[PDB]
Design a protein around this motif. Structure first.
Motif, short mmCIF file in Angstrom:
data_model
loop_
_atom_site.label_atom_id
_atom_site.label_comp_id
_atom_site.label_asym_id
_atom_site.label_seq_id
_atom_site.Cartn_x
_atom_site.Cartn_y
_atom_site.Cartn_z
N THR A 142 -0.18 -9.72 3.71
CA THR A 142 -1.49 -9.06 3.83
C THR A 142 -2.56 -10.11 3.55
O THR A 142 -2.84 -10.42 2.39
N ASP A 201 0.81 -1.22 0.00
CA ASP A 201 0.00 0.00 0.00
C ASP A 201 0.84 1.27 0.00
O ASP A 201 0.38 2.31 -0.49
N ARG A 208 -5.53 -10.77 0.63
CA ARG A 208 -5.58 -9.69 -0.35
C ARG A 208 -5.23 -10.17 -1.76
O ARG A 208 -5.78 -9.66 -2.75
#
Length: 322
Positions: free
Chosen positions: A72, A55, A75
């Motif tokens: 993550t 991100d 995701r």
């Protein structure tokens, strides 16, 4: 001239930083005649958890990151096919397969960045403080670290208590005792001094395959990439894609020798699980890929097709990188 910010979670004294990250940035800089420069940050020096790297690139906090997608949770479900039990041949071939798989089968999974490369590491190894792992029963009730949900799912089916955490967290967890051991490839072990914190290492004889590997992405901010002059974008492109993916995997696995030797020099016990016992691991872990296919189908993907393609692509690129 353009200065790109590069961020990752590796220690600077690691095989990855020294022989993959610094090498890649230097090749890009040299090929650009110095017009592309980097402000590079290892060891999460710009702040945040490793799970946040992707991100940060997406959001333009930095320009380029190298991370494990599975840091993550859920995701990036489709790239996880390469983390299923006994998928990889060698890292170079499997990295090339990963690139082609995402490009052709799952282009939307990373569509919020400009993906420069995709790769895997060498075969996973067990590192434990107290118990030698000769058979799967030796894992029963051990608190074992894995890097991603597919590896922790496998560990659970082997009888371990699985614990997910990123690489830099492993020393503090070994020392405070929240884990008994960790799944890691050999190459990274000295960068986190895991040969000093564990006594027993069980690798898999190549004849039996590779229990697991983890996937990595080298991702760039899309705005930053589109903003490059065409001539410098071409340099970036020349250092992206299939060949770069294979090269990263090859170099990561080439560091395994040095990690094993560091363990050996520290007077640790290394055991190689023979192919025949490896079959008991595959038997116990066989449901992991079945469950992944079912999870992909529930996500609206063609899970059977994805697994079929992944095996075929590994087979094909193993003919090139044998």
């Amino acid at each position: 001239t353009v200065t790109l910010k590069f961020h990752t979670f590796m220690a600077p004294q690691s095989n990855v930083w020294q022989n993959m990250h610094k090498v890649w940035m230097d090749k890009v800089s040299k090929e650009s005649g110095g017009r592309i420069q980097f402000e590079a940050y290892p060891a999460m020096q710009l702040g945040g958890s490793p799970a946040q790297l992707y991100d940060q690139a997406k959001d333009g906090v930095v320009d380029i990151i190298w991370t494990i997608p599975g840091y993550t949770a859920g995701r990036f479900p489709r790239i996880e096919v390469f983390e299923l039990p006994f998928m990889m041949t060698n890292a170079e071939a499997t990295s090339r397969a990963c690139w082609e798989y995402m490009q052709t089968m799952a282009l939307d999974e990373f569509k919020d960045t400009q993906v420069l490369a995709l790769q895997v590491h060498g075969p996973g190894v067990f590192h434990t403080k107290d118990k030698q792992i000769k058979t799967a029963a030796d894992l029963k009730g051990l608190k074992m670290r894995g890097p991603t949900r597919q590896v922790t799912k496998m560990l659970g089916y082997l009888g371990a208590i699985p614990v997910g955490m990123p690489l830099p967290a492993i020393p503090d967890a070994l020392s405070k005792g929240t884990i008994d051991g960790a799944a890691l490839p050999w190459e990274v072990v000295p960068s986190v001094k895991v040969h000093e914190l564990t006594r027993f290492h069980s690798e898999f004889d190549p004849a039996g395959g590779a229990l697991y590997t983890a996937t990595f992405v080298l991702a760039m901010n899309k705005a930053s990439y589109q903003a490059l002059p065409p001539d410098l974008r071409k340099i970036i492109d020349n250092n992206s894609g299939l060949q770069t993916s294979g090269w990263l995997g090859r170099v990561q696995q080439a560091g395994d020798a040095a990690g094993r030797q560091a363990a050996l020099a520290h007077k640790n016990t290394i055991y190689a699980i023979p192919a025949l016992e490896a079959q008991e691991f595959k038997r116990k872990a066989a449901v992991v890929e079945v469950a992944w296919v079912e999870d992909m189908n529930q996500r609206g993907f063609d899970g059977r097709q994805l697994l079929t393609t992944a095996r075929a692509l590994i087979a094909k690129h193993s003919k090139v990188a044998a």
